[PDB]
Subunit: 237 residues, 6 copies
């Protein structure tokens, strides 16, 4: 066991899907995985392990923010033999052409966190996903008839930022989605020699706003999970 | 409602106790509060409101890390009229004389987060608690026969820090406990004009280690909550 | 003797009150201390030792700015056995409700100095007073019928700032007074294992021109000194 | 003409390959392009335009370092209608398993330059390549039977670093090659709304002395150029 | 009058020599100036105006540290018509071949203060003296047969630095003397539109800790003053 | 030979003049030097050695930007016995009273590069020229009846800066010319133990954008070269 995961080596698959919302883990397990078994409950961060088309997959929420997801992803990698982490979540958009419910794949993640500067002697660490994982997700999306955008996310420490002007800067430099985890997950992946990818669906436009329905949201969430799961199978080849 | 709290103005008391572990909220409500009612369930962050010796109190977990607790504390203050937040949690000790199960009260909180530099034009914001809340907790502890230490916490972004030498620096400068939230809560309190306090019990010594029992841990957790609750009553005068 | 203090161990009390102006230290000794003798005059930085209600007390100027006061406080602590420093100064106010002549107690001090980043591995050190000293000062003020606000000071390196915009930021985050020393003294206290407190009277407002009389201002200054001295007597018990 | 390029719109193709050495751009044009004409010689920074398998292509040196290449890439993009830049260079390796002659594709580039912090409000901009360009290069390499590693470069400001310790850090975080330009070019591409990719061949190792033959090294260099050129043809489709 | 100087336009010469110690300003006035009158004593910061060889000259202490001297130099420049400031101070040496009592002229000044970053948008401002003044001092020293080195000073915020290793870096980069003011005075001169020079005498050795006689101190102190005063006369021609 | 210069000890004079443009080095060799021989052409970075009035002199381009010139100056110093580097460059003016074709001498150089912070433990290193060299250039200019201003340059990493407002700050602080090298050359001179000076001719105005004739360019270019060359002769005496 580790400080935040009451489990033993072997309880997790070598691939873990991670939503921020812990309630989604059980949903994913019941909706997409066969023969799922409970493998963690510490702090209510429920974790499950089962199979998707015969392939062992685990799912466990990561909580909000870089510090939270950094804890879970580190423990998974160092103590549970996890090789790949796929964060599946939502993001806010700043680009006019990026629309609600679009699927965005973070090949890179900008951040205003200090965690990577702490790792990288106060220089600029480019927080990046594993390239094959990115391409697997793009290909899996295309096979499902979904076109996904690939580029930079911005991983914010403050959901409520006092710096209103930063959204304009994000937009100028082509940021596709704003969330709060990717750069931290990518940093941990590099630190401990594993691979990661963050996929998000656009839940908000920080410009236009203009909302959606619960059924549309569930459909889109399901699409994202299908993409993530099918992408793993392509990665296995 | 707010993005992370499905409730309305009035559903929360003007004082909120916040553990990191969401499972503790329900425990606190059932163990210490009368007539408790459920007021939030979004993302499983259960929130309750009831009374302690007639005084309205709410309890809701804040999740791990500065970004997570910054979201909840902000929403509580700006949308739910919350005036005081008391984080109640655990910390790791670096000072030899600070012992397992000691109660520590963070009058200040150091941090390696960038969130306060972002707020404060890249200068040093001293992240501090409300003084009366600190003194109320000290006095409430003394009335319960518990001596509490008052000083600086260190609010870490990385539970698993690559900088081993930082613990020595923390120790040199008198840091009483290491946790992951106080500086962020204090920053939000200052940003939105409210008051906050972080109280922690020492769960680990990052030096000696040397563990405890489950019964001892529960007793100590109960002591901390009693301190927090009684401290509120002193604050009311 | 030390490089900036021509005195020997025993010449100072274990508590030293410190105004910025050495002429003001002579004022304090003459006005409040019995049997006061000058114990330093190097660089004109007058220091005195005498008694207050039978208690040995010293008072000595610290000069203007963090680097100046850091020299004197360090030397007192490491070479003259000084355990407590109480800065007694003036500050400017930025908050509408903070008025000329208010007494402000710096439980914390923000700063644009780099000195604490230098001490603390480029992270945020919360420069704090000693809690018991703060409480003693609050209680002494109450006994004298004086209101005292407890919160953050801002210790500035530049009395004449190019960044007028920083005053709006201090106001936003609730800074009670602007001065030039507290964060430096609190950093020295932490570094060398002593205790400190800064008390100021508001001598100026950013907006402004409320003004008072010389007699009233000098009365309030004296009240600050009485609070400081009486706080020592409470600590002793 | 621009301040550093004496040419007119149309003189360049919409894709430009860029080695650091202008003598190497002449080499590439002579070796791989048909009907190549020199289109720039300002400051000796030779640029050429010709065809590869009937496709219009340009090649031009970028000089050494982020500031030099930032000038040329900006001017090409804003004044010569250039849509894609492919840097073709050499890099040093720090990872044991990365060998002399390996082909490295910089999906991201780390850096100790301040240029992106200047662009991005002092936060972390993940300097990334264009994903489709990365995929085109990976696919072209595969068609040529060449292995290509995709990951982070480190773009250094100082070829002769005082900080020997930074190489251990790059190695720890998995950097595939050290060069001097990629992060700068990726920053320009993002700023001015174009697309870029850096491909390097490993010319040196930190440890070391594996060595090869001139013929083999030059063969691998040519393979990098073929990968670059063929990647364009794949993008066109 | 200004907030720290009780005097009026005309009371100061257009050139002011400034040691850190007000008592030294007094010594300089008594020893070198004719018809010297005291023009300030606010905060004990003695200032005098007299003549040297018929030339009107002032001398006034500036206290210790960048924040202190920044106050006095600013006020002199903006409110007393002062055109040139010549700091005449002491410094500690780090270079083995720099000896006690050596005269050093700071054409530039390094610093660990944040003040110039605050002025210069967090970039590197090279804090430099006025060239004509440097040259005047060099020539005067030559006419007096006094040796003088020209180069970089380092202006420290912490006389008692916790970073002993930085002295190795100063030594590496050829720093001639460590003092606490020059870089701030140079930044004020630039901000407020005047001219400045810092001359120091090596009063201690940071490595050897070695010693001097009372007689030696102020005959060399005298050499520094003579250089400063004669340099003004050259500048006048 | 070194990695960027194919030559041997003795091929270069102990003084090297360096423009950014290799073609200008060629022009200088042909115009000012007798018996000039080409000693390098690696990367097209032409270098020549000849005599000026019997004095052995070299001239070689250093390319654009701090990283480029840092490579060449280092190699010359460590492997070719070069004692003095004189940059002879162009710059853009920000001050209204600085005119096209004005000659500026950088006694200091500000910068937005991180290179000196990397050298100087993230403090402010004042990047300064050798004083004797500055004085030699001033005197030579006077003997030639050529006006020359002495002061700060600013060495930019981005010729195309996204921060237009910084030019207001440079203007405020009296920056004489904006170029891209001086601060890096000065940092190399200090690191590797040689001497350096940057002289520039104002080739454009950053505000007016105004214009010059071909004839005007290189007669003033010529004035700069004459100053540099004659300054060496003075230094030799």
């Amino acid at each position: 066991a580790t400080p935040h995961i009451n489990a033993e080596m072997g309880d997790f698959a070598d691939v873990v899907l991670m939503p921020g919302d812990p309630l989604r883990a059980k949903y994913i397990a019941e909706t997409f995985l066969e023969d799922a078994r409970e493998v963690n409950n510490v702090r209510g961060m429920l974790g499950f392990t089962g199979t998707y088309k015969g392939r062992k997959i685990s799912v466990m929420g990561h909580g909000m923010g870089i510090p939270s997801c950094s804890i879970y992803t580190k423990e998974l990698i160092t103590d549970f033999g996890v090789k790949k982490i796929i964060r599946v979540g939502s993001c806010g958009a700043v680009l006019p052409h990026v629309k609600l419910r679009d699927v965005v794949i973070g090949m890179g993640a900008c951040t205003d966190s200090k965690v990577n500067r702490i790792r990288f002697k106060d220089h600029d660490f480019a927080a990046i996903a594993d390239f094959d994982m990115v391409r697997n997700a793009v290909d899996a999306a295309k096979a499902l008839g979904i076109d996904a955008r690939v580029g930079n996310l911005f991983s914010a420490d403050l959901f409520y930022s006092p710096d209103g002007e930063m959204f304009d800067v994000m937009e100028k430099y082509g940021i596709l989605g704003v969330e709060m985890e990717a750069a931290g997950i990518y940093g941990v992946a590099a630190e401990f020699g594993a691979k990661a990818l963050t996929i998000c669906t656009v839940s908000d436009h920080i410009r236009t706003h203009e909302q959606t329905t619960a059924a549309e949201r569930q459909t889109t969430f399901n699409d994202m999970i299908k993409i993530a799961l099918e992408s793993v199978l392509l990665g296995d080849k």
